[PDB]
Design a protein around this nucleic acid. Structure first.
Lengths: 359, 524, 7, 23, 497
DNA sequence: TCTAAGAACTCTGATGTCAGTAGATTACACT
DNA sequence: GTGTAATCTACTGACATCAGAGTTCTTAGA
């Protein structure tokens, strides 16, 4: 709590919190002391990412000490083995130059454990351990990219294990597994994008379905994954031919049919606004005279993102920034058309800047 | 024993052709010998096997001839079985387009036994002839063969495609010639060396029972300080475990010694590693604290038995010893010592004097020195060929648990009503296994569970078979005949269905949950 | 008791 | 109730004093 | 009570000189009697139930230790799990020198007040966090009028002990041979739940009796599938189960600290700390090597899910008592699942006993275990001993062998004895007739082991060496039987041995 | 003229079990 | 969004138990 209250504020003393955590973890047997010792490292490494101090942490020692524990992973309690993988995959995030030769053997370890954990016949999955893998892997992929241009087999294996985590193939009564698979998919859809155009309807069906589940962090993890899915799918036809009109038709239909109607949370709805922004750079390629009308329709949708009908204390906290985060792409590469939209930008200027103290 | 086996198999043309309601006599015999070879392919017996084929379009033998000793191949010499023989039996063997003689193959096979039985050891010997009776022959050497089967001490088993309760005149006359040969060998028992392919496929269905002895143990049964009798017991029931353990092997090298198992030690003060030969001393635990012994001071204070004892404490009625309490790892059968005719009269007196009083013995026992002393009930019984007196362990006062389970005759909250009782009244007669089809007052014994082989070992060898013959493929289901054996199905299920149907209504059946498997993420 | 194939 | 229940170790049934053979 | 609740027990001795230093004889001493009791129930509870809680308290002493309500009381020991150092604290006060050792410290004969003493013990039980099943106080005072000379002192106690009983703490008593008389009907009549010498109860605290005592708990719960559909939940309970000397805890020599056995697998060639996925399992047969994964050496040996399938019915005579597999386990209903299934089970119990019948079942105690076959023999209760239930009603699981289990045993034939040789035996056997009872014997090793362990643990001068009850007492076998071994030696065999 | 293969028993270590405890997930819900 | 339920799923102490490994004895034995 105190490291979160204070943040990065005064860095030059911080190594002694690290030394307390690795000393606690090694000298105390109790998992309930190993858990906070790991937790405090996760936040410590995460907040000092950009710091002066990240070399004197001995970040290359820290991989060798916690990788060695996988030598006897069968003896480690299930919930501690979450945090070892949360940590290990984060080492690949914060300081890549010291991980440069190690992270490939860690890909072999993460995939080999997760294949074994998802596909074993002899036992039901250890849900905490499976979640720990998907969590650590989500930091690992930020550097050391397994983007489908190269290593096509491992990048397919990561993607169809994400389909195994994401699909409600049967329903769980706790959702830490989907919750972790969603964060992975959200940050790394860029890695697996040819598969996004292969499996495309089943992906948007299941992703949309998670948005209905009333659990709140599941819901936030669900929703933040659709934005990135549409983000990657946009880049896939920012530099591709007419072949994808069939796909663009499905997206320009369906999420527009939600935006123009739905009685649901600001997350589901402000994503579909994020969606409509992105497709300009795709859509200019078949017709410039649909690029203006999607700007006309964004602002002629703003009149109903306003009109929530007494939706107190929820709507402005995410609604209107999405109007503006979906309207540069419709002009960034163009120069054709004259604009009422500039004077009416007073409507968005005053609205937007008036609401600065309201969030 | 170390045995000789000689499969002498007819592979002529004709056995390819059949009564259409069965597999061909050729492939029937091939299946019998397959269902056989598997048995000693797993079982650790010391028994040599040979293969001889006859009706072969070529010939290979030590004794070659132009008309006799011809259309015969001595395909495999007399040695312990192996998986390549089983593959060759299962997949290699072909019918010849020609024909041959079983009397022919017999003389060659029996002469091969007369070669092989000299240069390496044996006790018992067999020759085994499989045919459709398409052999045409002169009735030549037969008296010298039957005389020589005694002088060589080899028994003949004979295997045929039809019953002994559509066959050709040639098969009828051939069987009367096989009968005449076995009548000449053994008389009335001789026809019990003859088997159909039908009954044998209906008997070779399973892997062998695990063969194990009970080891000899010599001792002295002692009813009082002066009077001892010689006794030598054998274990009789033992809950049996497989001989060979699962060895541990490296995934890529497949060598059973590329792994060393370091049992290393840690003190928790940052990985101070101990030496067991100097610094590790066993302790016991005593309430809220530990106390150190020495492994070498427990032996100074430990309860030591004064001898490898067996001695009776006294006697008392069958009433003192109820069913439930019996507590043993094993059962002994506790017998008069070999060639002690004084012990034989004395122990037959002992147990005949227990047969009539309903009295039982209570006895201190100990297998050997250092092992724990032991108590319990030496319980007599009788069979027409010997007196039984089994020994079984009974609890000490701290092995026995006493709990007042809330007692059920206080039925006012758990009502057993007239209609419920009048349903059950028919269940337990209706689903009887034991049927009264007798005047011995012994019922049919329709499901003799003590004669069934253990499904654990049938299942193990069945996997070792499949992964031997198909060395990279996935594992099979349970072979269906194992369920058909392990169920209790036939007529009893046809009787049960209606009395069970009135249970479903007269009694409630409120919910229970279910749990899942690899089905929690598996296809379709 | 049985022997041979019935070992 | 009291009659069978040990005072050293309550609820559990009273341990009787070992016995052995005596005629 | 429910499973988890500890027994918890507090010992509360009168430190007053008029009893403490007092005797009519020389041969005992009431304080030396109470302290012996406290050490001896406490050494029973150490072997038998290390989980259950003890405390010990002196009232009316002159120097004090309490949380509050302090006057003239000393909690020698607060509530704790029992062990050696506590038994060593009581040992210091025992004996003729002991009754001076106590005087140098807490001081003797001062005025006291039960309504404060009962307050103190109450606070004690309160202060502990654990769930308690039985809450009991033991009074070691002889002071039969507890100085209620002031009746308005005494009404405080009696009301406060009303409050003890009202809060479901119990309280219990022992009288300690006060000179000339003790009578509960004067006072203590309403504190406990015609005249006495000394309590017949107190000798039971000197039984020194040793076993683990482990409370009623299930082994597992299963569904008795009568067919594809009808099920009842039944329990599976362990009425007879061989005890073992407790597992020894390996220690570091130089400090007595516990140490971790910390095993790994290491490649014979190279530094690979091989993970469980790195290595398979295998066999050798027919000079070839068979390879299986660490999943499938335990996919083989599967057949069924946890339950009990019904297989039809038999006569109880055909279940031959010579072939016996492993110790019999009890079956008893459980409404925890399949509610009202007790109604079916009870009819099934009742009617099998009329039919003279067993049910045959196939039995799996777990997933990934083969089925054994088990006869459900039905059972009936002998409450005739004033409802001491020697036998609970339900079913016995009696296990049956398979072919592989019934090992071959060598050839022999004889029917040798004459009617005189049986006739003499029929005498000796009837001379040696006693009554076995199940509890009449004790394990010589496991009983000896605890006595060795105490000598080492409480630092005793000697191992108690208490001689076992399994040896035949051969001089009695000489005399009760008499000389009749000569009838075998004369009538039955020659003189050559 | 003796050297291993076959027993036998105890002991140690892991896996699964039950009862009970309590945390975090996650549903439900605000006009 | 924000806040309060209700309730699933974990972990631990403890108890049984199969397997696996250490240890003494018979037969077959140069």
């Amino acid at each position: 709590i105190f490291l979160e209250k204070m943040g990065q504020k005064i860095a030059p003393y911080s190594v002694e919190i690290k030394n307390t955590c690795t000393s606690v973890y090694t000298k105390d047997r109790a998992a309930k002391c190993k858990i906070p010792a790991l937790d405090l490292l996760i936040k410590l490494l995460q907040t000092f990412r950009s710091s002066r101090l990240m070399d004197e942490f001995k970040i290359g020692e820290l991989f060798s000490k916690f990788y060695g524990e996988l030598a006897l992973k069968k003896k480690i309690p299930d919930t501690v083995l979450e945090k070892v993988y949360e940590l290990l995959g984060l080492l690949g995030e914060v300081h890549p130059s010291e991980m440069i030769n190690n992270a490939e053997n860690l890909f072999r370890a993460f995939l080999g454990e997760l294949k074994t954990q998802m596909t074993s016949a002899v036992r039901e999955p250890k849900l905490p351990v499976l979640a720990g893998c998907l969590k650590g892997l989500s930091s690992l992929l930020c550097n050391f990219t397994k983007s489908m241009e190269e290593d096509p087999q491992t990048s397919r294996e990561i993607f169809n294990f994400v389909l195994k985590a994401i699909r409600p193939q049967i329903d769980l009564k706790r959702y830490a597994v989907p919750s972790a698979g969603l964060r992975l998919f959200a940050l790394h859809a860029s890695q697996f994008s040819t598969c996004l155009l292969d499996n495309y309807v089943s992906l948007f069906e299941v992703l949309l379905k998670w948005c209905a589940h009333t659990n709140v962090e599941l819901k936030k993890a669900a929703l933040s994954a659709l934005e990135s899915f549409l983000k990657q799918v946009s880049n896939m036809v920012a530099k591709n031919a007419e072949m994808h009109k069939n796909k663009l038709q499905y997206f320009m239909e369906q999420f527009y049919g939600i935006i123009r109607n739905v009685d649901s949370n600001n997350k589901e709805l402000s994503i579909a606004i994020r969606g409509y922004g992105l497709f300009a750079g795709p859509c200019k390629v078949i017709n410039a005279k649909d690029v203006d009308f999607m700007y006309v329709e964004l602002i002629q949708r703003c009149k109903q993102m306003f009109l929530t009908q007494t939706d107190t204390g929820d709507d402005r906290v995410y609604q209107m920034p999405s109007f503006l985060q979906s309207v540069a792409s419709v002009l960034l590469y163009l120069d054709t058309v004259p604009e009422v939209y500039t004077p009416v930008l007073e409507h968005l200027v005053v609205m937007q800047i008036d609401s600065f103290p309201q969030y | 024993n170390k045995a000789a086996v000689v499969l002498c198999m007819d592979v002529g043309f004709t056995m390819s052709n059949s009564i259409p309601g069965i597999e061909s006599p050729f492939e029937q015999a091939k299946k019998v010998i397959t269902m056989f070879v598997q048995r000693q392919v797993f079982a650790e017996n010391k028994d040599e096997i040979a293969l001889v084929l006859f009706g072969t379009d070529g010939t290979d033998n030590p004794l070659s001839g132009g008309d006799q000793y011809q259309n015969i191949t001595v395909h495999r010499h007399l040695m312990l079985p192996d998986f390549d023989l089983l593959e060759d039996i299962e997949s290699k063997i072909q019918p010849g387009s020609q024909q041959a003689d079983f009397l022919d193959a017999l003389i060659v096979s029996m002469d091969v036994i007369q070669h092989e039985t000299i240069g390496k050891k044996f006790e018992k010997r067999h020759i085994e002839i499989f045919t459709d009776l398409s052999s045409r022959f002169s009735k030549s050497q037969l008296d010298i063969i039957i005389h020589s089967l005694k002088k060589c001490d080899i028994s003949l088993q004979f295997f045929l495609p039809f019953s002994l309760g559509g066959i050709t005149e040639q098969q009828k006359e051939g069987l009367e010639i096989v009968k005449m040969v076995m009548i000449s060998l053994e008389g009335e028992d001789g026809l019990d060396e003859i088997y159909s392919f039908s009954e044998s496929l209906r008997k070779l269905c399973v892997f062998k029972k695990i063969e194990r002895h009970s080891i000899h143990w010599p001792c002295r049964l002692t009813i009082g300080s002066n009077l001892s009798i010689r006794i030598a017991a054998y274990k009789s029931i033992l809950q049996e475990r497989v001989k060979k353990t699962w060895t541990v092997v490296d995934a890529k090298t497949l060598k059973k010694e590329d792994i060393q198992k370091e049992t290393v030690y840690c003190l928790n003060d940052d990985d101070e590693t101990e030496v067991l030969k100097e610094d590790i001393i066993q302790g016991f635990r005593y309430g809220s604290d530990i106390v150190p012994f020495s492994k070498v001071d427990e032996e100074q204070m430990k309860y030591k038995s004064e001898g490898k004892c067996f001695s009776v404490l006294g006697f008392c009625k069958s009433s003192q010893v109820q069913r439930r309490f019996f507590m043993g790892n094993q059962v002994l059968k506790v017998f008069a010592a070999r060639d002690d005719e004084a012990a034989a009269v004395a122990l037959s007196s002992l147990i005949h004097a227990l047969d009539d009083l309903d009295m039982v013995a209570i006895v201190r026992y100990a297998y050997d020195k250092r092992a724990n002393p032991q108590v319990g009930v030496a319980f007599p019984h009788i069979k027409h060929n010997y007196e039984c007196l089994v020994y079984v362990q009974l609890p000490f006062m701290e092995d026995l648990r006493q709990y007042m389970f809330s007692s059920l005759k206080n039925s006012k909250k758990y009502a057993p009503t007239e209609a419920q009782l009048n349903a059950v009244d028919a269940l337990i007669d209706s689903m009887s296994l034991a049927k009264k089809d007798e005047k011995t007052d012994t019922l049919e014994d329709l499901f003799p569970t003590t004669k069934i082989p253990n499904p654990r070992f049938q299942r193990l060898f069945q996997c070792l078979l499949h992964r031997a013959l198909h060395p990279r493929e996935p594992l099979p289901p349970i072979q269906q005949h194992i369920w058909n054996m392990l169920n209790p199905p036939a007529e009893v299920t046809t009787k049960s269905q209606i009395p069970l149907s009135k249970i479903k209504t007269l009694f409630p059946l409120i919910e229970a949950k279910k749990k899942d498997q690899v089905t929690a993420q598996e296809i379709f | 008791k049985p022997r041979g194939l019935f070992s | 109730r009291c009659p069978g229940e040990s005072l050293i170790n309550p609820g559990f049934k009273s341990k009787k004093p070992a016995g052995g053979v005596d005629f | 009570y429910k499973y988890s609740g500890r027994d918890s027990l507090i010992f509360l001795v009168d430190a007053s000189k008029a009893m403490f230093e007092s005797q009519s004889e020389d041969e005992l001493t009431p304080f030396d009697m109470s302290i012996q009791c406290i050490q001896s129930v406490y050494i029973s509870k150490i072997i038998s139930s290390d989980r259950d809680l003890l405390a010990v308290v002196f009232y009316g002493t002159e120097k004090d230790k309490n949380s509050v309500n302090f006057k003239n009381i000393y909690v020698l020991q607060e509530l704790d799990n029992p062990g050696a150092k506590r038994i060593l604290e009581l040992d210091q006060f025992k004996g003729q020198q002991g009754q001076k050792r106590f005087q140098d410290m807490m001081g003797h004969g001062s005025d006291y007040s039960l309504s404060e003493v009962l307050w103190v013990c109450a606070n004690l039980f309160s202060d502990v966090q654990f769930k308690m099943s039985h809450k009991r106080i033991m009074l070691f005072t002889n002071e039969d009028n507890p100085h209620g000379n002031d009746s308005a002192k005494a009404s405080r106690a009696r009301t406060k002990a009303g409050d003890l009983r009202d809060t479901g703490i119990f309280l219990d008593l022992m009288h300690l041979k006060k000179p000339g008389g003790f009578d509960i009907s004067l006072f203590y009549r309403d504190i406990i739940s015609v005249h006495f010498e000394e309590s017949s109860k107190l000798e039971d605290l000197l039984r020194k009796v040793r076993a683990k005592e482990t409370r009623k708990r299930a082994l597992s719960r299963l569904k008795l599938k009568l067919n594809k559909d009808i099920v009842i939940s039944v329990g599976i309970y362990n009425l007879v189960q061989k005890a073992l000397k407790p597992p020894p805890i390996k220690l570091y020599r130089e400090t007595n600290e516990p140490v971790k056995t910390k095993t790994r697998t290491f490649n014979t060639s190279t530094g690979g700390l091989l993970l469980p996925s790195d290595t398979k399992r295998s066999q050798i047969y027919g000079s070839r090597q068979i390879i299986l994964e660490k999943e499938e050496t335990e996919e083989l040996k599967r057949f069924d899910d946890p339950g009990l399938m019904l297989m039809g019915f038999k006569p109880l005579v055909l279940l031959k008592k010579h072939h016996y597999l492993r110790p019999s386990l009890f079956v008893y209903p459980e409404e925890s699942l399949v509610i009202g299934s007790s109604t079916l089970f009870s009819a099934l119990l009742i009617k099998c006993l009329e039919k003279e019948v067993a049910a045959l079942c196939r039995y799996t105690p777990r997933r990934n275990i083969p089925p054994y076959f088990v006869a459900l023999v039905p059972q009936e209760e002998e409450l005739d001993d004033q409802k001491i239930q020697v036998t609970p009603p339900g079913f016995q699981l009696v296990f049956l062998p398979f072919a592989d289990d019934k090992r071959k045993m060598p050839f022999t034939e004889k029917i040798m004895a004459t009617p005189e040789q049986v006739g003499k035996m029929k005498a000796i056997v009837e001379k040696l007739r006693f009554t076995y009872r199940s509890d009449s014997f004790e394990n010589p090793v496991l009983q000896q082991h605890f006595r060795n362990l105490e000598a080492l643990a409480l630092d005793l001068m000697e191992p108690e060496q208490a001689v076992d009850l399994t040896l035949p007492k051969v001089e009695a076998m000489n005399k009760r039987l008499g000389s009749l071994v000569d009838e075998f030696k004369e009538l039955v065999y020659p003189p050559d041995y």
